[PDB]
Write a protein that binds this ligand. Structure first.
Ligand SMILES: Nc1ncnc2c1ncn2[C@@H]1O[C@H](COP(=O)(O)OP(=O)(O)OP(O)(O)=S)[C@@H](O)[C@H]1O
Ligand SMILES: Nc1ncnc2c1ncn2[C@@H]1O[C@H](COP(=O)(O)OP(=O)(O)OP(O)(O)=S)[C@@H](O)[C@H]1O
Ligand SMILES: [Mg+2]
Ligand SMILES: [Mg+2]
Lengths: 357, 45, 58, 87, 121, 190, 55, 401
């Protein structure tokens, strides 16, 4: 069987082709006194924790090699030389990094066959639509990738540096403003948990602000690991609002809805209708409740009234990229697309540009 | 050879990586050339 | 009905095995080590390797 | 009528499946191992031309040709037989 | 003629009831699906046709004849002879012309003594 | 019957067929791919001996190919253009119609643009030196080359080329009535 | 009038290689577009088949 | 000898509308952000789309380029730095850079650009090729008449053997900016208040011709007139792309009135049917004599070729290449081809190269740059830093023709 590996800035998703869900999901981090994954986070006190993938781009290739080695040997417990490996890359990744992926897979892991797919087109595969725009928001970066008939349009791609890690830091600040203690480096994981459990997106931010200031019925309580319980309210939606109002963080940029509208407008006039009809949200940072309706109302405000807006947010959109990778690797037509060992030997690491798109 | 079918009008061109590519030209009679079993090239050892 | 109309999945294309000694199209497979080979010299080399490996392993 | 409808819907689906591209890739054997030949009615054989990158020059036999000049004049010097005598 | 790729029956409501049996046949040229009369189900099981078998079906009688596993599934390790045949070349559907030369004496001899009575003869 | 095109023949052209293994499935080609291992490739600096400076650019090449002579350097050879001393000009090449610095500019341009006299004419410094026709540049260049060869071959005919261009210009500038007239003659004289 | 003959210069070989590379670019772009269309329509058929099979 | 060598070079094509950049060997620029940048007088620069589209107090909208040539080197450095850091994400000293330049770029400007690239960005190698040659190279043609109509100029540039015949360059001011001004005048005549989308808090659906029912954004800061004009220009250019169409022949009022209307919706919800005026506006590119001595695009073409050697005119007419964003107006290519076929001498074959798509029209220069940078035979042409040590003034003009 083929191996589908989605390497993300925050957590790596790995598994076998055709499966419904990834077999293993673990944080993408290397710890040196080399320990990778939840073993590294278990040993924060003795290891120097570094993330190799920043905004979807590989920085330290040795750390990435170690992450892939840990994946293949400990996570899936398979031999890389036996299985084809389908990797994912972030959009607008440098050419040299895509070459390095190819070289590492063929020369260090001796994989039989390899392919590199763009993460947005895999999210679109999981959506099951030919033409659409993907708003994938992960840990460190948010992209808006318009795709026409399965071919990504690199020129219309727009990138936003706001993502779930900055939202974790903003909820940490807001909790400190409420007077709770979270500033130390481990308690950041508790802010992450309360963000994943209690946060929600307001349909109308000023109405929710006024109601939560006027009434306490919107407040909810969360139990800290040490037994203390805190009540958070109004704060439950101020954090996700930073996606739509990045000025909360001090970043002078457009919101995710505005970025999506600008990326759509960068495309041809005729294909814009299909993009509006298929606005696909993927990534963990899009898992907040009500984000589909808020995005619908914002895009409807921006888009022409004669244009039909339809946000697609399946319940499984946190893994949409890997589900799409798995669907692609299980296809009969895809089998001709594998870079073979012989092709690499005869054409070099630049073969990835000749075959993969 | 695979498939044993006339692919119609083609030309052999070397690609960037040394990969030999068959460029293909559209013709109105392409379906007839598909049913087919003029200068008509065939591969041989 | 399912007896008369079994929905049989199409058979998998076989692995075109190759001899690990000379890299020729495989003609045989050794009963003991279950490794294909293509010539008598390959068989002798494979059996010598197998005895050495079984000695090293135990 | 239900069968007629379902067969027309089937033919529509088959047409959709066939309008999509048929071939994208051919075998390595066809690509490199086998040369392409054509034999005419007289038994003469022609090899299919391969458009390769430019070959390095061994000597000065690679004479330059002006591709724009060949749009107005033909590429061969006029034979002396049909050339008018010296004025 | 072609290698069998599918044998899916087409269920229906009777005005399990089947109205067709779909056979997919593959040759070197391409692939074709046929919408055969359901009664051909008897001949398919009589010939023990399965996926990966080369078969041929004549237009007139509609009876199927099986002529072996496609050689693409033969390994060098398994031993059988009569049960493998190369994948057919040409289009899946074929029109064959057979021309035979005979004499009236040949017909005379054939009809005079056709070839347990045969054992003694 | 055949088709010709450069890049591609029409927008409706079918895509090229690329070579690849595993098109018939990975499983059947599993043993062949597993029997071998790839050769190592390197991102390596290379010397280009066509360059005179010695700058090193980088390649993807196999390890064994490191340090090998750059193959594209074999293309590097310039159009043969003679070089003359100040003395040789003073002895042989002097012309009252041409300045020495003007001829040196012409020959420098010729060495720059590989005797593409249309490009030399475009790049010719008509502001500083006298205005020259392309026939004048060809005349001066081929005259000097012939004289130097004789001192140390199809000769140029400036008048014939001038007449040829003048005739082509006259044939080009004529009005649509004056080409309708000629085509009506060409069709009626048959 | 025939120009004096000369062999090809470096720039002539550059323009030949340029023409070959431009052809390769155009054909590769056409291939990538068509392959993407093929794969996506195959995925859409895979979902349509799944829906019709599970119904 | 073999396929072209990729040396990891970068290709920059900084035009007046968008900065097109990417890695050599790719078939499309990986980034194209608007050339216009935001400036705050302290200066703070907001460069890409994510930053430009949000209101800011006392932020002006400026462009580093003037008449196809860079004038403000500070803004040029800002754009280059942003491109590197955000999109390229690689050090400038690590990758060779090939940049395009205008057909008419001055020698002093080329020297200044080379000095900037070597002293400031410390690049290992450099090359400067003309946009017209790269456009020809994108099409595999070594010779031909490039016709470029961007936002600043409509220019015919004859290329022969990969060299721009500078004497034959003919330039006209009629371009995308002229069309934007024409659309502005049309909107003014129809009393349509151009409300940029940034001012609209909410809008409601209204019928055609009905007054716009929109709510203004609150707490909006004061904005400079330049930024407001830039946003209005953005919406006008969306209108240009969506509505305008070139007539298949010389514009006629009756035929224009017969043909069906096209419906457009403005950001504030206002919508209208634009009738026949949508055809009148692009007619100025072909027949400027009717606009309230400029030469039409077909006359720019036929004039430019007439200034070249008649040995090369057959090739120039035999390879006409259309490039630039303003050429994407509907039926522009068809009208141009018709007019050129009507005006061309019968004795010479005329052929417009058929590539008519957004990528092939707008990014053609970048594609040609990538093709050129990927050639193994081109690796001789680079200007090295060691060469810049000696010929920092001498060789830069001589190494890049
Ligand atoms: N239920 C949830 N609601 C909202 N956010 C969530 C939820 N669960 C997880 N997250 C956040 O979403 C992110 C999940 O990481 P991913 O989506 O995999 O990003 P990544 O793929 O690792 O990085 P990139 O940007 O894709 S390279 C983290 O920032 C989580 O904190
Ligand atoms: N699809 C389109 N339809 C119509 N006009 C378009 C289209 N796309 C872009 N334009 C216009 O084309 C112009 C920009 O064309 P470009 O050639 O890209 O400009 P540029 O090359 O970046 O700068 P210059 O003027 O060439 S120096 C603007 O006026 C746009 O409004
Ligand atoms: Mg991700
Ligand atoms: Mg331009």
């Amino acid at each position: 069987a083929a191996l589908v590996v989605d390497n993300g800035s925050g957590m790596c998703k790995a598994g076998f082709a055709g499966d419904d869900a990834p077999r293993a999901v673990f944080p993408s981090i290397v710890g040196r006194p080399s320990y990778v994954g939840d073993e590294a986070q278990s040993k924060r006190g003795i290891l120097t924790l570094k993330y190799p993938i920043e905004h979807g781009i590989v920085t330290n290739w040795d750390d990435m090699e170690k992450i892939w080695h840990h994946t293949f040997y400990n996570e899936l417990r398979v031999a890389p030389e036996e299985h084809p490996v389908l990797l994912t890359e972030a959009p607008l990744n440098p050419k040299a990094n895509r070459e390095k992926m190819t070289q590492i897979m063929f020369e260090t892991f001796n994989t039989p066959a390899m392919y590199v797919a763009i993460q947005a087109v895999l999210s679109l595969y999981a959506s099951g639509r030919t033409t659409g725009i993907v708003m994938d928001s992960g840990d460190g970066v948010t992209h808006t990738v318009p795709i026409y008939e399965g071919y990504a349009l690199p020129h219309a791609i727009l990138r936003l540096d706001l993502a779930g890690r900055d939202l974790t830091d903003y909820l940490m600040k807001i909790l400190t403003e409420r007077g709770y203690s979270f500033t130390t480096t481990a308690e950041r994981e508790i802010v992450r948990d309360i963000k994943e459990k209690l946060c929600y997106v307001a349909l109308d931010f000023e109405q929710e602000m006024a109601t939560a200031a006027s009434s306490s019925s919107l407040e909810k309580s969360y139990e800290l690991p040490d037994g203390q319980v805190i009540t958070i309210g109004n704060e439950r939606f101020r954090c996700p609002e930073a996606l739509f109002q990045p000025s909360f963080l001090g970043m002078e940029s457009c919101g995710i809805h505005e970025t999506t509208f600008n990326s759509i407008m960068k495309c041809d006039v005729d294909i814009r209708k299909d993009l509006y009809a298929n606005t696909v949200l993927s990534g963990g940072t899009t898992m907040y409740p009500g984000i589909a309706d808020r995005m619908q109302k914002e895009i409807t405000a921006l888009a022409p009234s004669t244009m039909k807006i339809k946000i697609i947010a399946p319940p499984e959109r946190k893994y949409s990229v890997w589900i799409g990778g798995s669907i692609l690797a299980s296809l009969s037509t895809f089998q001709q697309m594998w870079i073979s060992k012989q092709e690499y030997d005869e054409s070099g690491p630049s073969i990835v540009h000749r075959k993969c798109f | 050879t695979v498939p044993q079918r006339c692919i119609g009008f083609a030309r052999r061109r070397v690609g960037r990586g040394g990969r030999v590519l068959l460029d293909r030209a559209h013709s109105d009679y392409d379906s007839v050339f598909h049913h087919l079993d003029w200068r008509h090239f065939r591969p041989r050892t | 009905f399912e007896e008369w109309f079994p929905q049989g999945r199409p058979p998998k294309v076989p692995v075109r095995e190759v001899c690990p000694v000379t890299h020729r199209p495989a003609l045989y497979r050794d009963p003991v080590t279950d490794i294909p080979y293509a010539t008598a010299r390959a068989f002798k080399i494979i059996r010598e390797a197998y005895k050495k490996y079984i000695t090293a392993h135990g | 009528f239900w069968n007629l409808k379902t067969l027309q819907e089937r033919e529509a689906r088959l047409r959709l499946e066939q309008e999509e591209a048929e071939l994208l890739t051919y075998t390595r054997e066809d690509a490199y191992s086998m040369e392409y030949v054509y034999e005419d009615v007289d038994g003469q054989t022609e090899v299919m031309p391969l458009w390769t990158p430019p070959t390095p020059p061994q000597d000065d036999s690679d004479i330059y040709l002006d591709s724009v000049m060949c749009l107005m004049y033909e590429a061969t010097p006029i034979p002396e037989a049909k050339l008018p005598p010296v004025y | 003629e072609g290698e069998v790729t599918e044998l899916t029956p087409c269920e229906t409501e009777n005005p399990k009831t089947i109205s067709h049996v779909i056979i997919g046949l593959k040759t070197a040229k391409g692939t074709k699906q046929l919408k055969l009369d359901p009664s051909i189900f008897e001949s398919l099981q009589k010939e023990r046709v399965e996926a990966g078998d080369v078969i041929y079906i004549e237009a007139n009688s509609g009876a199927v004849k099986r002529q072996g596993r496609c050689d693409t599934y033969a390994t060098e390790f398994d031993l059988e002879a009569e049960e493998y045949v190369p994948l057919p070349k040409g289009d899946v559907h074929k029109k064959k012309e057979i021309i035979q030369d005979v004499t009236l004496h040949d017909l005379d001899v054939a009809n005079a003594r056709p070839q347990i009575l045969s054992m003694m003869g | 019957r055949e088709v010709y095109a450069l890049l591609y023949s029409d927008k409706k052209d079918a895509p090229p067929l690329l070579p690849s293994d595993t098109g018939q499935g990975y499983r059947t080609v599993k043993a062949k791919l597993g029997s071998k291992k790839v050769r190592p490739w390197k991102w390596m600096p290379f010397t280009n001996p066509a360059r005179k400076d010695g700058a090193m650019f980088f390649h993807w090449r196999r390890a064994a190919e490191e340090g090998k002579d750059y193959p594209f350097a074999r293309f590097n050879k310039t159009v043969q253009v003679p070089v003359y001393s100040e003395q040789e000009y003073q002895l042989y090449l002097h012309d009252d119609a041409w300045t020495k610095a003007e001829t040196d500019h012409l020959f420098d341009l010729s060495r720059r643009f590989d005797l593409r006299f249309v490009v030399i004419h475009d790049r010719y410094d008509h502001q500083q030196f006298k205005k020259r026709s392309v026939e004048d540049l060809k005349e001066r260049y081929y005259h000097i080359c012939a004289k130097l060869a004789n001192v140390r071959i199809p000769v140029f005919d400036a008048g014939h080329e001038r007449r040829r261009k003048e005739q082509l210009e006259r044939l080009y500038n004529r009005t649509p009535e004056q080409v309708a007239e000629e085509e009506y003659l060409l069709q009626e004289l048959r | 009038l025939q120009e004096a003959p000369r062999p090809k210069s470096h720039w002539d070989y550059l323009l030949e290689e340029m023409q070959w590379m431009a052809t390769d670019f155009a054909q590769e772009r056409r291939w990538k577009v068509a392959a993407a269309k093929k794969l996506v329509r195959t995925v859409v058929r895979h979902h349509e088949e799944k829906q019709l099979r599970e119904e | 000898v073999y396929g072209g060598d990729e040396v990891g070079a970068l290709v920059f094509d900084i035009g007046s509308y968008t900065v097109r950049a990417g890695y050599a060997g790719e078939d499309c620029p990986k980034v194209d952000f608007p050339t216009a940048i935001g400036m705050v007088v302290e200066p703070t620069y907001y460069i890409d789309t994510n930053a430009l589209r949000v209101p800011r107090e006392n932020m002006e909208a400026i462009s580093p380029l003037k008449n196809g040539m860079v004038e403000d080197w500070d803004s040029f450095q800002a754009i280059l730095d942003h491109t590197y850091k955000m999109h390229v994400k690689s050090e400038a000293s690590l990758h060779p850079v090939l940049m395009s330049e205008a057909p008419w770029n001055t020698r002093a400007k080329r020297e200044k650009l080379t000095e900037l690239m070597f002293e400031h960005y410390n690049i290992p190698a450099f090359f400067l090729c003309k946009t017209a040659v790269l456009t020809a190279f994108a099409n595999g043609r070594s010779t031909g008449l490039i016709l470029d109509s961007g936002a600043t100029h409509t220019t015919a540039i004859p290329v022969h053997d990969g060299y721009v015949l500078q004497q034959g360059i003919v330039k006209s001011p009629l371009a995308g900016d002229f069309i934007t001004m024409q659309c502005r005048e049309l909107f003014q005549e129809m009393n349509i208040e151009l409300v940029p989308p940034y001012m609209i808090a909410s809008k409601e659906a209204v019928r055609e011709g009905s007054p716009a029912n929109w709510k203004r954004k609150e707490k909006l800061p004061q904005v400079t007139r330049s930024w407001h004009n830039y946003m209005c220009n953005c919406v006008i250019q969306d209108f240009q792309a969506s509505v305008l169409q070139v007539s298949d022949s010389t514009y006629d009022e009756q035929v224009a009135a017969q043909m069906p209307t096209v419906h457009y919706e403005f950001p504030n919800g206002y919508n209208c049917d634009f009738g026949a005026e949508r055809l009148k506006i692009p007619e100025g590119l072909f027949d400027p004599s009717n606009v309230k001595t400029m030469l039409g695009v077909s006359h720019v073409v036929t004039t430019s070729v007439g200034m070249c050697d008649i040995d090369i005119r057959p090739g120039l007419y035999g390879s006409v290449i259309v490039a630039g964003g303003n050429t994407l107006i509907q039926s522009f290519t068809d009208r141009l081809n018709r007019e050129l076929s009507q005006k061309t001498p019968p004795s010479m074959r005329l052929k417009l190269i058929a590539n008519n798509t957004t990528v092939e029209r707008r990014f053609s220069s970048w594609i040609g740059g990538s093709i050129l940078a990927s050639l193994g035979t081109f690796q001789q042409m680079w200007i090295s830093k060691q060469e810049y040590e000696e010929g920092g003034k001498q060789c830069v003009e001589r190494k890049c023709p």
